[PDB]
Symmetry: D2
Subunit: 255 residues, 4 copies
């Protein structure tokens, strides 16, 4: 099942969409400058692009780390990003009451992994009618994502993206099960599946050569998109796009 996001078609058999930006919104000037780098590299490679940032990050490394500019100013910034670049945007929400005003502006709203089971947030997200990105908890098996999907369906919204971020592997480590993508496709109605390579790695060419190997491996399984929590970018995306074009150009095996 494909999902239309303005002029973008997101789907497991469509060219991959890149989801990328900054961690937290600080200022309009800072945001536009970063977004302009992503936009210029992606436009030049012809890769569809969705800008990501948090306006209010509830899951911070420290208590007093900056949460972001907040709902009101954040949504202003996002409006400016959409107007200047003509691209869709994505942001996370952690409180039910935030969902509706965020959804007036943000094309995709994101369910953080740690809140993925919180029924009230699921419901309030669903009721926006917006495209939703469901982050897979590291403790949830791929065959149980269908239960989160079910709850969104009960609450009236089927425009759902499934985002892999790795699975708990002993202590501390995360491993990404390359079979999980296929399990999610088979059990969740072939909804678009995207890969958050960055998180998948935070606990493991340095990080750069690893991110590339892991992104390649995941995209080889035929996925709707790639999600980075962030010329260097350009070399990376050239390789991802090469693999993605090859894979998507071949028909799926046939019974």
């Amino acid at each position: 099942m494909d999902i239309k996001i303005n002029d973008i078609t997101l789907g497991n058999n469509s060219p991959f969409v890149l989801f990328g930006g900054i961690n937290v919104l600080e200022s309009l000037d800072s945001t536009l400058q970063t977004c302009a780098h992503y936009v210029e590299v992606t436009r030049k490679l012809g890769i569809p692009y969705i800008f990501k940032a948090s306006f209010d990050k509830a899951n911070r490394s420290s208590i007093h780390s900056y949460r972001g500019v907040g709902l009101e100013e954040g949504l202003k910034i996002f409006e400016k990003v959409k107007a200047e670049f003509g691209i869709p945007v994505i942001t996370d929400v952690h409180e039910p009451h935030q969902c509706q005003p965020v959804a007036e502006v943000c094309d995709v709203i994101q369910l953080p992994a740690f809140l993925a089971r919180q029924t009230d947030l699921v419901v309030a997200m669903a009721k926006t009618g917006n495209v939703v990105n469901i982050k897979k908890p590291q403790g949830l098996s791929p065959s149980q994502m269908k239960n989160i999907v079910e709850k969104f369906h009960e609450a009236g919204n089927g425009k759902l993206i499934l985002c892999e971020r790795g699975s708990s592997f002993g202590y501390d480590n995360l491993v990404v099960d390359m079979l999980g993508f296929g399990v999610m496709k088979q059990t969740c109605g072939n909804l678009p599946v995207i890969f958050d390579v960055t998180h998948s790695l935070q606990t493991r060419g340095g990080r750069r050569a690893q991110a590339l190997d892991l992104a390649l491996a995941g995209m080889a399984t035929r996925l709707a998109g790639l999600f980075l929590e962030s010329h260097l970018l350009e070399d990376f995306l050239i390789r991802i796009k090469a693999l993605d074009d090859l894979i998507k150009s071949q028909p799926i095996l046939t019974i």
Copy 2:
């Protein structure tokens, strides 16, 4: 470090405290009846007791599932439990705004495992000044528990209980690492450590008893369970736990 909860002393070298009750509050009558059974059994065995229940089930499989009586009616029920039995009580919170009104009534407030990294909830819980029970996420190693502890300390509250509930083991399965208790004691200032045997089993009453015994053998402040154990096996179960706990606590550490 010991923590005082009314007349109870909770600590890794003190007699074990039982945190027990029901999953979700449904009615006043049901709750008082169950609580009376726990109270009568624990008082006769001489085991300190804290009554546990949730006023809300925040992650049901269905949006249409029964979720509990809710904050307002739930706190009423907890006030009645405290007035009738004179015991401390414990319940979980899911939203920052709930922390203060819950803490006015509930002696111990609990950070659910899924929310343990919701920084705003941590901060709002800490500011209550109440005793807090931190449920260890199944994806968090015992040597990183100190990071949650740090955050509570930075926000001004050192009255923290660490609650083991098992660790992710492949898909859909939990294992309890009996070495984790010691790692938590060593790295988190010997704060009280308690064992949630019930949730620790959930992926799998002979097994609860074996697992509870194993955990208490490592010398713990408390045991945390639901009744899930059938309610009339409770007295026989606790007789065995208390026997082991008395033996272990009577031997000096080294």
Copy 3:
């Protein structure tokens, strides 16, 4: 099901039996000196005792690190241990050909974990008629131990001990599932289960882990020393024995 090993009764409802000694046999004088320490401590606490060592360590940190004295000398050392102390002994075998000559001397022979699925070794061990200790591979779930058991039974030997040594937990790391004991008891005919706390561990940690395991009601404890330091042995065993006495004195629920 209990198993008789000379005058010892080994069984999940019997006082725990200590299986203890050294990693690899390196000399006669030093083996006897270590064994004497075990024997004096265990006799003083009234704990039944089986001396353990390998004559040939197959998985060494380096290729030329010493394998041990070897089969011929190793069996002579074990005969000396049995003559001097009158206690049973246990050792591992790696090759089918070694089974017979080892079993003539040793009261228990041990199937190493890495070889536990080698059908020829299983068959040759079984055919000795000896008591066998089956080391649980770290990659094998407790509900699959029954398949090793089955193969021993097909080959004619039901005098089997099951030995827990932990399970792979992510990379390079072991966790002991305290529910695995019960699963093995339930699926393998309540054969004696013992706990190798030493190999499970990679201390105050050894003691905690040993206590936790023995709290689940087991036939025995399996450990090494030099690994626990040899003079803390008595203090360690006093605590194990206290817990084991308490647990075994209560009827099963």
Copy 4:
């Protein structure tokens, strides 16, 4: 580091080599038939090929289960495979004494995963001088493969292939860590790394393909496995492999 196996160059920056055949040798006729299928498909796609089989099933469901033809007859069969098809072959060894006679015939000898820490087997394998395929135990981290490699080097043999076969993931289940390939390359001198996709998988055709593709996307020397299913599968692997090998490393 590349390894020459007759006319084949095996190496992490070379076209992938398929290691394929049957589980256990049963008879000359059914072995030749299966081998001929692999040979005809690989030749027609232009993929280098090494035939694999065991002469002995070391872990059998029953003591009475069929075990395979055994060393003597098994080596006869391998000689006939080499003579008829002119390809290298690979088989596993379980006992030190078997190493030399197996190595006389078999181009590559394989160290099974369960025996990978059996030092006497390591030493006897090493002393053959043959190309060795080291099966990575499901309980061993990728950063520890270097310790096995070190032992083979101390015993005088650097012609080693590292073979990924998945890692224990809870009970009774495997997962393949796609970062492990790179860790092994970086810590073990860039020795050839291959991927046993078949054993890594504790319908099923779609899974093997996804997993094989994911692994070969990390740039590997080879792939190891057991209406036209093989060819349709290898067509896709070879497409990916050609793309990945044509891009320079960064």
